[PDB]
JSON list of C-alpha atoms in Angstrom, two decimals:
[
{"chain": "P", "resi": 1, "resn": "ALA", "atom": "CA", "xyz": [-22.12, 8.08, -16.82]},
{"chain": "P", "resi": 2, "resn": "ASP", "atom": "CA", "xyz": [-19.08, 7.80, -14.54]},
{"chain": "P", "resi": 3, "resn": "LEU", "atom": "CA", "xyz": [-16.57, 5.24, -13.27]},
{"chain": "P", "resi": 4, "resn": "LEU", "atom": "CA", "xyz": [-14.92, 5.24, -9.84]},
{"chain": "P", "resi": 5, "resn": "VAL", "atom": "CA", "xyz": [-12.80, 2.19, -10.65]},
{"chain": "P", "resi": 6, "resn": "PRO", "atom": "CA", "xyz": [-15.35, -0.51, -9.68]},
{"chain": "P", "resi": 7, "resn": "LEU", "atom": "CA", "xyz": [-12.55, -3.05, -10.15]},
{"chain": "P", "resi": 8, "resn": "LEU", "atom": "CA", "xyz": [-10.94, -2.26, -6.79]},
{"chain": "P", "resi": 9, "resn": "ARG", "atom": "CA", "xyz": [-14.37, -1.52, -5.32]},
{"chain": "P", "resi": 10, "resn": "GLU", "atom": "CA", "xyz": [-15.53, -5.08, -5.78]},
{"chain": "P", "resi": 11, "resn": "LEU", "atom": "CA", "xyz": [-11.97, -6.14, -5.00]},
{"chain": "P", "resi": 12, "resn": "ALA", "atom": "CA", "xyz": [-11.99, -4.63, -1.52]},
{"chain": "P", "resi": 13, "resn": "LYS", "atom": "CA", "xyz": [-14.94, -6.94, -0.90]},
{"chain": "P", "resi": 14, "resn": "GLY", "atom": "CA", "xyz": [-12.49, -9.82, -1.28]},
{"chain": "P", "resi": 15, "resn": "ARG", "atom": "CA", "xyz": [-14.90, -12.05, -3.17]},
{"chain": "P", "resi": 16, "resn": "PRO", "atom": "CA", "xyz": [-14.66, -14.16, -6.37]},
{"chain": "P", "resi": 17, "resn": "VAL", "atom": "CA", "xyz": [-15.23, -11.68, -9.19]},
{"chain": "P", "resi": 18, "resn": "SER", "atom": "CA", "xyz": [-15.44, -13.08, -12.72]},
{"chain": "P", "resi": 19, "resn": "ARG", "atom": "CA", "xyz": [-15.36, -11.16, -16.00]},
{"chain": "P", "resi": 20, "resn": "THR", "atom": "CA", "xyz": [-19.10, -11.51, -16.53]},
{"chain": "P", "resi": 21, "resn": "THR", "atom": "CA", "xyz": [-19.53, -9.95, -13.10]},
{"chain": "P", "resi": 22, "resn": "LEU", "atom": "CA", "xyz": [-16.86, -7.33, -13.62]},
{"chain": "P", "resi": 23, "resn": "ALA", "atom": "CA", "xyz": [-18.58, -6.87, -16.95]},
{"chain": "P", "resi": 24, "resn": "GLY", "atom": "CA", "xyz": [-21.99, -7.12, -15.37]},
{"chain": "P", "resi": 25, "resn": "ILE", "atom": "CA", "xyz": [-20.92, -4.68, -12.70]},
{"chain": "P", "resi": 26, "resn": "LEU", "atom": "CA", "xyz": [-19.29, -2.28, -15.11]},
{"chain": "P", "resi": 27, "resn": "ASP", "atom": "CA", "xyz": [-22.35, -2.75, -17.27]},
{"chain": "P", "resi": 28, "resn": "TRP", "atom": "CA", "xyz": [-19.74, -3.15, -19.96]},
{"chain": "P", "resi": 29, "resn": "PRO", "atom": "CA", "xyz": [-19.19, -5.95, -22.53]},
{"chain": "P", "resi": 30, "resn": "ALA", "atom": "CA", "xyz": [-16.99, -8.87, -21.47]},
{"chain": "P", "resi": 31, "resn": "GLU", "atom": "CA", "xyz": [-14.60, -7.74, -24.22]},
{"chain": "P", "resi": 32, "resn": "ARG", "atom": "CA", "xyz": [-13.94, -4.38, -22.62]},
{"chain": "P", "resi": 33, "resn": "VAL", "atom": "CA", "xyz": [-13.16, -6.13, -19.39]},
{"chain": "P", "resi": 34, "resn": "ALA", "atom": "CA", "xyz": [-11.04, -8.59, -21.32]},
{"chain": "P", "resi": 35, "resn": "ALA", "atom": "CA", "xyz": [-9.12, -5.76, -22.95]},
{"chain": "P", "resi": 36, "resn": "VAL", "atom": "CA", "xyz": [-8.19, -4.64, -19.44]},
{"chain": "P", "resi": 37, "resn": "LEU", "atom": "CA", "xyz": [-6.77, -8.02, -18.40]},
{"chain": "P", "resi": 38, "resn": "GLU", "atom": "CA", "xyz": [-5.40, -8.41, -21.94]},
{"chain": "P", "resi": 39, "resn": "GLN", "atom": "CA", "xyz": [-2.45, -6.35, -20.68]},
{"chain": "P", "resi": 40, "resn": "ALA", "atom": "CA", "xyz": [-2.45, -7.67, -17.12]},
{"chain": "P", "resi": 41, "resn": "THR", "atom": "CA", "xyz": [-0.71, -11.00, -17.23]},
{"chain": "P", "resi": 42, "resn": "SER", "atom": "CA", "xyz": [1.21, -10.40, -14.00]},
{"chain": "P", "resi": 43, "resn": "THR", "atom": "CA", "xyz": [-2.12, -10.31, -12.15]},
{"chain": "P", "resi": 44, "resn": "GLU", "atom": "CA", "xyz": [-2.77, -13.37, -9.98]},
{"chain": "P", "resi": 45, "resn": "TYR", "atom": "CA", "xyz": [-5.67, -15.58, -11.04]},
{"chain": "P", "resi": 46, "resn": "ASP", "atom": "CA", "xyz": [-7.55, -18.25, -9.08]},
{"chain": "P", "resi": 47, "resn": "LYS", "atom": "CA", "xyz": [-9.58, -21.39, -9.78]},
{"chain": "P", "resi": 48, "resn": "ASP", "atom": "CA", "xyz": [-10.64, -21.09, -13.44]},
{"chain": "P", "resi": 49, "resn": "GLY", "atom": "CA", "xyz": [-8.94, -17.75, -13.97]},
{"chain": "P", "resi": 50, "resn": "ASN", "atom": "CA", "xyz": [-10.91, -15.20, -11.97]},
{"chain": "P", "resi": 51, "resn": "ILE", "atom": "CA", "xyz": [-9.52, -12.06, -10.32]},
{"chain": "P", "resi": 52, "resn": "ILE", "atom": "CA", "xyz": [-8.08, -13.05, -6.94]},
{"chain": "P", "resi": 53, "resn": "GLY", "atom": "CA", "xyz": [-7.57, -9.41, -6.04]},
{"chain": "P", "resi": 54, "resn": "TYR", "atom": "CA", "xyz": [-4.90, -8.34, -3.56]},
{"chain": "P", "resi": 55, "resn": "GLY", "atom": "CA", "xyz": [-2.89, -10.18, -0.92]},
{"chain": "P", "resi": 56, "resn": "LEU", "atom": "CA", "xyz": [0.50, -8.51, -0.58]},
{"chain": "P", "resi": 57, "resn": "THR", "atom": "CA", "xyz": [2.28, -11.44, 1.07]},
{"chain": "P", "resi": 58, "resn": "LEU", "atom": "CA", "xyz": [1.36, -15.02, 1.96]},
{"chain": "P", "resi": 59, "resn": "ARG", "atom": "CA", "xyz": [0.98, -14.05, 5.62]},
{"chain": "P", "resi": 60, "resn": "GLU", "atom": "CA", "xyz": [4.56, -14.27, 6.90]},
{"chain": "P", "resi": 61, "resn": "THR", "atom": "CA", "xyz": [5.66, -10.72, 7.75]},
{"chain": "P", "resi": 62, "resn": "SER", "atom": "CA", "xyz": [5.54, -8.30, 10.68]},
{"chain": "P", "resi": 63, "resn": "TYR", "atom": "CA", "xyz": [3.56, -5.47, 9.06]},
{"chain": "P", "resi": 64, "resn": "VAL", "atom": "CA", "xyz": [-0.14, -6.24, 9.49]},
{"chain": "P", "resi": 65, "resn": "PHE", "atom": "CA", "xyz": [-2.99, -4.35, 7.84]},
{"chain": "P", "resi": 66, "resn": "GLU", "atom": "CA", "xyz": [-6.54, -4.94, 9.08]},
{"chain": "P", "resi": 67, "resn": "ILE", "atom": "CA", "xyz": [-9.47, -3.48, 7.13]},
{"chain": "P", "resi": 68, "resn": "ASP", "atom": "CA", "xyz": [-13.22, -3.88, 7.70]},
{"chain": "P", "resi": 69, "resn": "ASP", "atom": "CA", "xyz": [-12.93, -7.61, 8.28]},
{"chain": "P", "resi": 70, "resn": "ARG", "atom": "CA", "xyz": [-9.92, -8.73, 6.28]},
{"chain": "P", "resi": 71, "resn": "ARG", "atom": "CA", "xyz": [-6.48, -9.19, 7.82]},
{"chain": "P", "resi": 72, "resn": "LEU", "atom": "CA", "xyz": [-3.71, -8.22, 5.40]},
{"chain": "P", "resi": 73, "resn": "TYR", "atom": "CA", "xyz": [0.08, -8.42, 5.53]},
{"chain": "P", "resi": 74, "resn": "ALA", "atom": "CA", "xyz": [2.98, -6.47, 4.06]},
{"chain": "P", "resi": 75, "resn": "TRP", "atom": "CA", "xyz": [6.75, -6.37, 3.61]},
{"chain": "P", "resi": 76, "resn": "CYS", "atom": "CA", "xyz": [6.96, -2.73, 4.69]},
{"chain": "P", "resi": 77, "resn": "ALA", "atom": "CA", "xyz": [4.86, -0.16, 6.56]},
{"chain": "P", "resi": 78, "resn": "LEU", "atom": "CA", "xyz": [3.65, 0.95, 3.12]},
{"chain": "P", "resi": 79, "resn": "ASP", "atom": "CA", "xyz": [2.84, -2.42, 1.51]},
{"chain": "P", "resi": 80, "resn": "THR", "atom": "CA", "xyz": [0.22, -2.78, 4.25]},
{"chain": "P", "resi": 81, "resn": "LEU", "atom": "CA", "xyz": [-1.82, 0.00, 2.64]},
{"chain": "P", "resi": 82, "resn": "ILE", "atom": "CA", "xyz": [-2.17, 1.58, -0.80]},
{"chain": "P", "resi": 83, "resn": "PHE", "atom": "CA", "xyz": [-5.19, 3.89, -0.93]},
{"chain": "P", "resi": 84, "resn": "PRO", "atom": "CA", "xyz": [-7.20, 4.24, 2.33]},
{"chain": "P", "resi": 85, "resn": "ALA", "atom": "CA", "xyz": [-9.15, 7.20, 0.97]},
{"chain": "P", "resi": 86, "resn": "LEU", "atom": "CA", "xyz": [-10.13, 5.08, -2.04]},
{"chain": "P", "resi": 87, "resn": "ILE", "atom": "CA", "xyz": [-11.43, 2.30, 0.22]},
{"chain": "P", "resi": 88, "resn": "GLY", "atom": "CA", "xyz": [-13.98, 4.35, 2.04]},
{"chain": "P", "resi": 89, "resn": "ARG", "atom": "CA", "xyz": [-13.40, 2.76, 5.44]},
{"chain": "P", "resi": 90, "resn": "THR", "atom": "CA", "xyz": [-10.91, 2.50, 8.30]},
{"chain": "P", "resi": 91, "resn": "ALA", "atom": "CA", "xyz": [-7.66, 0.52, 8.14]},
{"chain": "P", "resi": 92, "resn": "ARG", "atom": "CA", "xyz": [-5.89, -0.78, 11.22]},
{"chain": "P", "resi": 93, "resn": "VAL", "atom": "CA", "xyz": [-2.15, -0.84, 10.72]},
{"chain": "P", "resi": 94, "resn": "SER", "atom": "CA", "xyz": [0.28, -2.67, 12.99]},
{"chain": "P", "resi": 95, "resn": "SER", "atom": "CA", "xyz": [4.06, -2.51, 12.98]},
{"chain": "P", "resi": 96, "resn": "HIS", "atom": "CA", "xyz": [7.09, -3.31, 15.16]},
{"chain": "P", "resi": 97, "resn": "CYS", "atom": "CA", "xyz": [10.08, -1.05, 15.86]},
{"chain": "P", "resi": 98, "resn": "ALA", "atom": "CA", "xyz": [13.21, -2.17, 14.02]},
{"chain": "P", "resi": 99, "resn": "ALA", "atom": "CA", "xyz": [15.24, -1.09, 17.05]},
{"chain": "P", "resi": 100, "resn": "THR", "atom": "CA", "xyz": [13.11, -1.38, 20.16]},
{"chain": "P", "resi": 101, "resn": "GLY", "atom": "CA", "xyz": [10.79, -3.99, 18.69]},
{"chain": "P", "resi": 102, "resn": "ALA", "atom": "CA", "xyz": [7.90, -2.22, 20.37]},
{"chain": "P", "resi": 103, "resn": "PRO", "atom": "CA", "xyz": [4.42, -3.02, 19.02]},
{"chain": "P", "resi": 104, "resn": "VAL", "atom": "CA", "xyz": [3.37, -0.01, 17.01]},
{"chain": "P", "resi": 105, "resn": "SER", "atom": "CA", "xyz": [-0.07, 0.45, 15.52]},
{"chain": "P", "resi": 106, "resn": "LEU", "atom": "CA", "xyz": [-1.92, 3.16, 13.66]},
{"chain": "P", "resi": 107, "resn": "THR", "atom": "CA", "xyz": [-5.41, 3.50, 12.27]},
{"chain": "P", "resi": 108, "resn": "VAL", "atom": "CA", "xyz": [-5.53, 4.67, 8.66]},
{"chain": "P", "resi": 109, "resn": "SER", "atom": "CA", "xyz": [-8.86, 6.25, 7.73]},
{"chain": "P", "resi": 110, "resn": "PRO", "atom": "CA", "xyz": [-10.02, 7.87, 4.45]},
{"chain": "P", "resi": 111, "resn": "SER", "atom": "CA", "xyz": [-9.59, 11.29, 6.09]},
{"chain": "P", "resi": 112, "resn": "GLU", "atom": "CA", "xyz": [-6.90, 10.73, 8.74]},
{"chain": "P", "resi": 113, "resn": "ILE", "atom": "CA", "xyz": [-5.77, 8.52, 11.62]},
{"chain": "P", "resi": 114, "resn": "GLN", "atom": "CA", "xyz": [-7.87, 7.55, 14.65]},
{"chain": "P", "resi": 115, "resn": "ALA", "atom": "CA", "xyz": [-5.61, 5.36, 16.71]},
{"chain": "P", "resi": 116, "resn": "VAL", "atom": "CA", "xyz": [-1.98, 6.26, 17.19]},
{"chain": "P", "resi": 117, "resn": "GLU", "atom": "CA", "xyz": [-0.02, 4.01, 19.55]},
{"chain": "P", "resi": 118, "resn": "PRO", "atom": "CA", "xyz": [2.41, 4.82, 20.86]},
{"chain": "P", "resi": 119, "resn": "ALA", "atom": "CA", "xyz": [1.44, 8.50, 20.73]},
{"chain": "P", "resi": 120, "resn": "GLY", "atom": "CA", "xyz": [4.54, 9.61, 18.89]},
{"chain": "P", "resi": 121, "resn": "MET", "atom": "CA", "xyz": [5.61, 6.76, 16.60]},
{"chain": "P", "resi": 122, "resn": "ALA", "atom": "CA", "xyz": [7.99, 7.48, 13.71]},
{"chain": "P", "resi": 123, "resn": "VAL", "atom": "CA", "xyz": [8.28, 6.13, 10.17]},
{"chain": "P", "resi": 124, "resn": "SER", "atom": "CA", "xyz": [11.39, 5.33, 8.15]},
{"chain": "P", "resi": 125, "resn": "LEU", "atom": "CA", "xyz": [11.96, 5.70, 4.40]},
{"chain": "P", "resi": 126, "resn": "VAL", "atom": "CA", "xyz": [14.75, 5.46, 1.83]},
{"chain": "P", "resi": 127, "resn": "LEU", "atom": "CA", "xyz": [16.14, 7.78, -0.84]},
{"chain": "P", "resi": 128, "resn": "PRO", "atom": "CA", "xyz": [15.76, 7.09, -4.60]},
{"chain": "P", "resi": 129, "resn": "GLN", "atom": "CA", "xyz": [18.85, 5.53, -6.20]},
{"chain": "P", "resi": 130, "resn": "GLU", "atom": "CA", "xyz": [19.81, 5.41, -9.88]},
{"chain": "P", "resi": 131, "resn": "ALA", "atom": "CA", "xyz": [23.14, 3.59, -9.77]},
{"chain": "P", "resi": 132, "resn": "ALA", "atom": "CA", "xyz": [22.37, 0.09, -8.49]},
{"chain": "P", "resi": 133, "resn": "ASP", "atom": "CA", "xyz": [22.08, -3.36, -10.07]},
{"chain": "P", "resi": 134, "resn": "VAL", "atom": "CA", "xyz": [18.77, -4.79, -11.29]},
{"chain": "P", "resi": 135, "resn": "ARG", "atom": "CA", "xyz": [16.56, -6.76, -8.91]},
{"chain": "P", "resi": 136, "resn": "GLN", "atom": "CA", "xyz": [14.62, -4.44, -6.62]},
{"chain": "P", "resi": 137, "resn": "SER", "atom": "CA", "xyz": [16.78, -1.53, -5.46]},
{"chain": "P", "resi": 138, "resn": "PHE", "atom": "CA", "xyz": [14.73, -1.16, -2.28]},
{"chain": "P", "resi": 139, "resn": "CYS", "atom": "CA", "xyz": [11.25, -1.37, -3.79]},
{"chain": "P", "resi": 140, "resn": "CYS", "atom": "CA", "xyz": [9.98, -0.22, -0.39]},
{"chain": "P", "resi": 141, "resn": "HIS", "atom": "CA", "xyz": [12.22, -0.65, 2.65]},
{"chain": "P", "resi": 142, "resn": "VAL", "atom": "CA", "xyz": [9.64, 1.25, 4.70]},
{"chain": "P", "resi": 143, "resn": "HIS", "atom": "CA", "xyz": [9.82, 0.55, 8.43]},
{"chain": "P", "resi": 144, "resn": "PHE", "atom": "CA", "xyz": [8.33, 2.15, 11.53]},
{"chain": "P", "resi": 145, "resn": "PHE", "atom": "CA", "xyz": [9.94, 3.27, 14.76]},
{"chain": "P", "resi": 146, "resn": "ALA", "atom": "CA", "xyz": [8.32, 3.48, 18.19]},
{"chain": "P", "resi": 147, "resn": "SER", "atom": "CA", "xyz": [9.25, 7.17, 18.13]},
{"chain": "P", "resi": 148, "resn": "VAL", "atom": "CA", "xyz": [11.36, 9.93, 16.55]},
{"chain": "P", "resi": 149, "resn": "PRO", "atom": "CA", "xyz": [14.20, 9.53, 19.11]},
{"chain": "P", "resi": 150, "resn": "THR", "atom": "CA", "xyz": [14.31, 5.81, 18.54]},
{"chain": "P", "resi": 151, "resn": "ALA", "atom": "CA", "xyz": [13.73, 6.34, 14.87]},
{"chain": "P", "resi": 152, "resn": "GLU", "atom": "CA", "xyz": [16.49, 8.90, 14.99]},
{"chain": "P", "resi": 153, "resn": "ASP", "atom": "CA", "xyz": [18.37, 6.90, 17.64]},
{"chain": "P", "resi": 154, "resn": "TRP", "atom": "CA", "xyz": [18.34, 3.66, 15.73]},
{"chain": "P", "resi": 155, "resn": "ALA", "atom": "CA", "xyz": [18.77, 5.84, 12.67]},
{"chain": "P", "resi": 156, "resn": "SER", "atom": "CA", "xyz": [22.09, 7.09, 13.99]},
{"chain": "P", "resi": 157, "resn": "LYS", "atom": "CA", "xyz": [23.36, 3.52, 13.83]},
{"chain": "P", "resi": 158, "resn": "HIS", "atom": "CA", "xyz": [21.55, 2.98, 10.55]},
{"chain": "P", "resi": 159, "resn": "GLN", "atom": "CA", "xyz": [23.54, 5.36, 8.36]},
{"chain": "P", "resi": 160, "resn": "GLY", "atom": "CA", "xyz": [25.60, 4.55, 5.29]},
{"chain": "P", "resi": 161, "resn": "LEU", "atom": "CA", "xyz": [22.67, 2.93, 3.49]},
{"chain": "P", "resi": 162, "resn": "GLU", "atom": "CA", "xyz": [21.13, 4.31, 0.30]},
{"chain": "P", "resi": 163, "resn": "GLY", "atom": "CA", "xyz": [20.10, 7.53, 2.02]},
{"chain": "P", "resi": 164, "resn": "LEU", "atom": "CA", "xyz": [17.50, 6.40, 4.54]},
{"chain": "P", "resi": 165, "resn": "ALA", "atom": "CA", "xyz": [15.44, 9.08, 6.28]},
{"chain": "P", "resi": 166, "resn": "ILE", "atom": "CA", "xyz": [13.12, 9.28, 9.29]},
{"chain": "P", "resi": 167, "resn": "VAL", "atom": "CA", "xyz": [9.70, 10.90, 9.53]},
{"chain": "P", "resi": 168, "resn": "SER", "atom": "CA", "xyz": [6.59, 11.34, 11.64]},
{"chain": "P", "resi": 169, "resn": "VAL", "atom": "CA", "xyz": [3.68, 9.10, 10.76]},
{"chain": "P", "resi": 170, "resn": "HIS", "atom": "CA", "xyz": [1.83, 12.43, 10.64]},
{"chain": "P", "resi": 171, "resn": "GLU", "atom": "CA", "xyz": [4.04, 13.74, 7.84]},
{"chain": "P", "resi": 172, "resn": "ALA", "atom": "CA", "xyz": [4.22, 10.25, 6.32]},
{"chain": "P", "resi": 173, "resn": "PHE", "atom": "CA", "xyz": [0.50, 10.48, 5.56]},
{"chain": "P", "resi": 174, "resn": "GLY", "atom": "CA", "xyz": [0.98, 13.80, 3.79]},
{"chain": "P", "resi": 175, "resn": "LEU", "atom": "CA", "xyz": [3.86, 12.50, 1.72]},
{"chain": "P", "resi": 176, "resn": "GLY", "atom": "CA", "xyz": [1.94, 9.32, 1.12]},
{"chain": "P", "resi": 177, "resn": "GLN", "atom": "CA", "xyz": [-1.24, 11.26, 0.40]},
{"chain": "P", "resi": 178, "resn": "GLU", "atom": "CA", "xyz": [0.59, 13.55, -2.04]},
{"chain": "P", "resi": 179, "resn": "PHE", "atom": "CA", "xyz": [1.84, 10.61, -4.12]},
{"chain": "P", "resi": 180, "resn": "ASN", "atom": "CA", "xyz": [-1.67, 10.47, -5.58]},
{"chain": "P", "resi": 181, "resn": "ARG", "atom": "CA", "xyz": [-1.18, 13.67, -7.57]},
{"chain": "P", "resi": 182, "resn": "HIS", "atom": "CA", "xyz": [2.17, 12.28, -8.71]},
{"chain": "P", "resi": 183, "resn": "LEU", "atom": "CA", "xyz": [0.66, 8.99, -9.89]},
{"chain": "P", "resi": 184, "resn": "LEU", "atom": "CA", "xyz": [-2.46, 10.68, -11.25]},
{"chain": "P", "resi": 185, "resn": "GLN", "atom": "CA", "xyz": [-0.25, 12.17, -13.97]},
{"chain": "P", "resi": 186, "resn": "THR", "atom": "CA", "xyz": [-0.47, 10.01, -17.09]},
{"chain": "P", "resi": 187, "resn": "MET", "atom": "CA", "xyz": [3.02, 11.01, -18.22]},
{"chain": "P", "resi": 188, "resn": "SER", "atom": "CA", "xyz": [5.68, 13.69, -17.70]},
{"chain": "P", "resi": 189, "resn": "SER", "atom": "CA", "xyz": [5.69, 16.08, -14.74]},
{"chain": "P", "resi": 190, "resn": "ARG", "atom": "CA", "xyz": [5.83, 19.81, -15.50]},
{"chain": "P", "resi": 191, "resn": "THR", "atom": "CA", "xyz": [5.93, 21.97, -12.37]},
{"chain": "P", "resi": 192, "resn": "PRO", "atom": "CA", "xyz": [9.31, 22.11, -10.55]}
]
C-alpha cells in the first residue's frame, strides 16, 4: 500500500493517459483522480481533455533536454530538467554559452552526471528579489557557460543585474538536488 506518484511515472512515458487509466493505474476511483485535477485547471489538456503531461516550451529555445527517447526544450538550463532522480533514467542536457556560444552538454542521471562537455562547464543563476513588479521577476534566468572563467569572464560584464551568480555544474547539481528537501516541506521551514 504505497504511492510513488504514478502520475509523473506514466507521464514520463509521454502517452495519452485518461482518468480511467490514471484511475485504473492508481487502482483508485475516477473521483479521487478527479479531485486531483479538480484543483489543477492550469494543467494543459489535449483532445477530449486528457493529461498531455509536460512540454516546457513549444520547441523554440536553445536549452535542449533529451531523455530516453523524448526530445525536450526549455527556457533555461533548469527548465530542461526537474527531477532526474525521480525519472529513473538518464537525461541528456544541451546548452550554449551566453558569451562564447560554445555548445555545452551534460548528462543528468538519477545518481550523477555521465557526460560533461566541455570538461569544466559553468552554470549561472540569479538571486531572489522581493522588490520588483509583478510578471515573472526572473522565474528562472538560468544559463550555462562553457567554463568558470568564461562564466566569470562574461559574468564580469554581466553585473548590475538582480544579483546573478556563477557556479560549477558540479555544485549546481547539489544545490539543485537539495531543493528537494526544501520543496518536500509542506509548509514553514524551521532550521536556520
